[PDB]
Amino acid sequence: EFDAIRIGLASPEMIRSWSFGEVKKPETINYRTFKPERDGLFCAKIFGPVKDYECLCGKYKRLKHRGVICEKCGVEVALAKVRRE
Amino acid sequence: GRSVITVGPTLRLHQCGLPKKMALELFKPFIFGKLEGRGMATTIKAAKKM
Amino acid sequence: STGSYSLVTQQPLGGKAQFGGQRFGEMEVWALEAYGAAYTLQEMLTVKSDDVNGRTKMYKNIVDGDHRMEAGMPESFNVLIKEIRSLGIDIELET
Amino acid sequence: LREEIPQTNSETKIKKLSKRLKLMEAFQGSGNKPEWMVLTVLPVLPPDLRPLVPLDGGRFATSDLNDLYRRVINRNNRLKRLLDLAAPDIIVRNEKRMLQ
Amino acid sequence: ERVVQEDRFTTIHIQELTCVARDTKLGPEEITADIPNVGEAALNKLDEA
Amino acid sequence: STEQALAVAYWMFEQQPGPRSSTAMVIDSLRERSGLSPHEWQAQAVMTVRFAQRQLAAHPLELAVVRAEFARGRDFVLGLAALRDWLKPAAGPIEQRAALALLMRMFRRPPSSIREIERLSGLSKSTLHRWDKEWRERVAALLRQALLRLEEPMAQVG
DNA sequence: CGGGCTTCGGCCAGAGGTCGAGGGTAATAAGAGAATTTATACCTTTATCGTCCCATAG
RNA sequence: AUACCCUCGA
DNA sequence: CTATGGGACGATAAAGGTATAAATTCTCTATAATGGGAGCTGCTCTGGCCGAAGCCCG
Secondary structure, rough: OOOOOOOEEOHHHHHHOOOOOOOOOOOOOOOOOOOOOOOOOOOOOOOOOOOOOEEEOOOOOOOOOOOOOOOOOOOEOOOHHHHHH | OOOOOOOOOOOOOOOOOEEEHHHHHHOOOHHHHHHHHHOOOHHHHHHHHO | OOOOOOOOOOOOOOOOOOOOOOOOHHHHHHHHHHHHOOOHHHHHOOOOOHHHHHHHHHHHHHHHHHOOOOOOOOHHHHHHHHHHOOOOEEOOOOO | OOOOOOOOHHHHHHHHHHHHHHHHHHHHHHOHHHHHOOOOOOOOHHHHHHEEEOOOOOOOOOOOHHHHHHHHHHHHHEEEEEEHHOOOOOHHHHHHHOOO | HHHHHHOOOOOOOOOOOOOOOOEEOOOOOOOOOOOOOOHHHHHHHHOOO | OHHHHHHHHHHHHOOOOOOOOHHHHHHHHHHOOOOOOOOHHHHHHHHHHHHHHHHHOOOOOHHHHHHHHHOOOHHHHHHHHHHHHHHHOOOHHHHHHHHHHHHHHHHHOOOHHHHHHHHHHOOOOOHHEEEEHHHHHHHHHHHHHHHHHHHHHHHHOO
């Protein structure tokens, strides 16, 4: 449970704490391959995986490691709902 | 759901008419539950078919 | 009865054509509040819409024939929280 | 401001200084820092809350949030790569105005 | 019931439904009756084209 | 198929419908080019799980094996505990932990290497390998028997 | 006679019923070619983990 | 399956 | 006479090399060209906000 929702100014430090990456590229999706690009507005490094419990390369497809981030695939494998938080 | 209303003069004050299709669509999970409880349907595909 | 919902806010779409449900807007919510009926209002704005983990569990309960209605928290409030945060003003809870 | 609040008997001035006191005490109590008003870093909305809903036929429908975010990102990238080469002051200030 | 029996207020409604053959990335979609996993009676209602 | 139906039912019971069809996933799918609805499919999965549990109630070991092979969460934990109780009744706490780790490794759960199991337990690789070889055959026989027993009721109930 | 001090006039913000229902419309042009990185593809080298023979402790 | 515009009903 | 730890074994997956074609961004072209343009005008009130102009005033 919870109560007493607060409102305040956002600190740059707490803004960093909120974020999961540094968006740096303006473009969103490549016209050739239809996956979000690095440092883009939909990048898997920052916002999460496109498919639930999957990574960019498919190095790990099993439904077992839900928090581990692969070596080649730095995009942590997790549930697709995480693109909302 | 919604529909045009119609006066029902044979209705008691506590009740209202409801079309067969609207009632069947709205109460679909209840119908599925009762069908499974009575055993008339085994799989939900059979219940949907009925 | 149940169907696809909007992708941003997990609410049923609108209009025969997209299936869709009628909206308990502000006035109908006020009408329910004027009645003492709070459980149907809470289930109406919580279980019938805007809750992912609530809809499926309520469907389960209806199929098994028990009406428990585990509440959860609407997804639209989460969307509001993230929008206000993206406006650069902090939101939290006192737990 | 508290010391100077009762010195002036003007109603308008006392009202303005009372509003000043209210804001200052609010900042002091609320744990809020005045420098946070000017954001040196801003967030970006999660992608599903600013989605691009593809139009049928292979087109993509971009939300206004995506357009605005793209504009901000482009102007920020322009800013860094024009300060790193020491562009003249006028164009630098114009770019800062555009980013604002 | 005469007004329905005499069929006075019946009306004819014509509605249209469309299909477009898009240039899909893998290939063009073809208007063919061999729909994959298609039942027989429904195919019987359809033609060869 | 009975195995496919059981696997799908277990997966749908373990995982809720999901927040939505992901917008990026939806966008990627729609730009790169079932008879029952989501809630209906989930209700079907629950009904199938209930039917499988009721039919296999005559053999607790078979139900535990099915839960371990397909189900997750509390059902997976119960199946693993029942398998440990059956295969290794008098195992010591270290032996019980090693057996549980090996059983989890059988179901692709972590740890994924017998070396990690030895590190977490201290058992010899020979004994662990022999135990795994025997348990794999025993569990395969039990699962085949359970599937054979449940195949007829699955076709009977469609 | 400057000066607080009240008052008034110009300027901007915000807000304006709900729920349907249907229909429609949504957004373009440098080539060359050099260069740099990156995903690919084959191959070798080391460790790892599945695997079984063997001596032995009870 | 997103926003405007138009038309219509209470 | 038997179960178990110990040690030997070996088939393969990962690690690194290591080039190699794709691919994807980067850099140039030399008559001259040296302040944009759609922007509504037919709300209505209320409310607040500054800023100026009289209004006491000692």
